[PDB]
Ligand binder design. Structure first.
Ligand SMILES: CCc1cc(CNC(=O)[C@H](Cc2ccc(OP(=O)(O)O)cc2)NC(=O)Cc2ccc(F)cc2)ccc1F
Lengths: 103, 88, 169
């Protein structure tokens, strides 16, 4: 059923959830409410692969087992003037080295 | 207003449901603009905090078996201080 | 009394666990454990006059129950099951649980029953009543990494927090 996701673009991350039966188009409709960019001006990716707007998240691979609230799956987001931009996701800072006591 | 934006110290923005952000007692005081700037919490810590907001809201009840919340040893010192700063 | 003070603290720690279910009947525990993996456990009040607390745990055969005894300031597993010299005593009941959990994590005990009549308690993961705080989840992780919290790069206020609950479960 429920699938939990991080929708990521550059330095922006959306925490949202959907149903495994939800479509990709339903996902872009979520993006529009929060980011005010219409669905046709959107591209969504799982890893380096573009997602067909009419598929369910399930048929894209987002299972409940793999998209948990404590470990959400990542969806990449690219925006469209005439050209669609390249998918680009800025990484989080890296953790410091573990102190010796804790190693 | 259904969502709020939380910004880490290295400039990452996290958009989460406003109801979710309220699990933090510190955030609930300020919110109860729609953005909060954490100028001492980095993104590797703040992202994990947001995952906890999700997990906490999903798993308040116990009609589902509550799974474990994995925390890498490397963030746990900083995550502790963040969790204590945000009161969650 | 120094006894009564140690028992108050024992009960304080218990409230921190997130897996203390308070007043829960044996049949509610059996229902709540029915679909859980082998070794899943919780602690709850005993419905028996002479016992404070009972462990409920999923075995391969289904949920079973094991009472905890308190006598002269110390906790141990019910002495009905084995000779008391084989049932280690503890000042806190969370520590009792932690011990048996670490025993199984360390593979010093498995789900197969021993043949020489010693204590056979297979415990893996607790059943949480609700999502614990993020602070407590971090405390659990630091406890699984080290016991030397006073040398940690942390404010004294947060070392006092870690000191209130030193267990790995
Ligand atoms: C692996 C844990 C372990 C267990 C033992 C033997 N254990 C028992 O034979 C317990 C006694 C018992 C009963 C009730 C109770 O609950 P309480 O009265 O204290 O609330 C506390 C103890 N029998 C049951 O579990 C049967 C039962 C199960 C589910 C149910 F729904 C109703 C009844 C020895 C060593 C061990 F390591």
């Amino acid at each position: 059923m429920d699938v939990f996701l991080m929708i990521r673009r550059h330095k922006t991350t959306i925490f949202t959830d959907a149903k495994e039966s939800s479509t990709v188009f339903e996902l872009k409709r979520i993006v529009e409410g929060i980011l005010k960019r219409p669905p046709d001006e959107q591209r969504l990716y799982k890893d380096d692969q573009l997602l067909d707007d009419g598929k369910t998240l399930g048929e894209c691979g987002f299972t409940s087992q793999t998209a948990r609230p404590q470990a959400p799956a990542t969806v990449g987001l690219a925006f469209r003037d005439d050209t669609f931009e390249a998918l680009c996701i800025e990484p989080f800072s890296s953790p410091p080295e573990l102190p010796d006591v804790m190693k | 207003m259904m969502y709020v934006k939380l910004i880490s110290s290295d400039g990452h923005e996290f958009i989460v449901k406003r109801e979710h952000a309220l699990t933090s007692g510190t955030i609930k005081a300020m919110l109860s603009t729609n953005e909060v700037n954490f100028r001492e919490i980095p993104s590797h810590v703040l992202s994990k905090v947001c995952m906890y907001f999700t997990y906490k809201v999903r798993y308040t009840n116990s009609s589902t078996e509550i799974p474990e919340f994995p925390i890498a040893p490397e963030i746990a010192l900083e995550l502790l201080m963040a969790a204590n700063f945000l009161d969650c | 009394s120094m006894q009564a003070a140690r028992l108050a603290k024992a009960l304080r720690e218990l409230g921190q666990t997130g897996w203390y279910w308070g007043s829960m009947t044996v049949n509610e525990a059996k229902e709540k454990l029915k679909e859980a993996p082998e070794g899943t456990f919780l602690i709850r009040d005993s419905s028996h006059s002479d016992y404070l607390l009972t462990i409920s745990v999923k075995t391969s055969a289904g949920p079973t129950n094991l009472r905890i005894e308190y006598q002269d300031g110390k906790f141990r597993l019910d002495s009905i099951i084995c000779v008391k010299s084989k049932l280690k005593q503890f000042d806190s009941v969370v520590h009792l649980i932690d011990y048996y959990v670490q025993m199984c994590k360390d593979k010093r005990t498995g789900p197969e029953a021993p043949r020489n009549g010693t204590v056979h308690l297979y415990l893996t993961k607790p059943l949480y009543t609700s999502a614990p705080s993020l602070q407590h989840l971090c405390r659990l992780t630091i406890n699984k990494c080290t016991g030397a919290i006073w040398g940690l790069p942390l404010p004294t206020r947060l070392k006092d927090y870690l000191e209130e609950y030193k267990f790995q479960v």
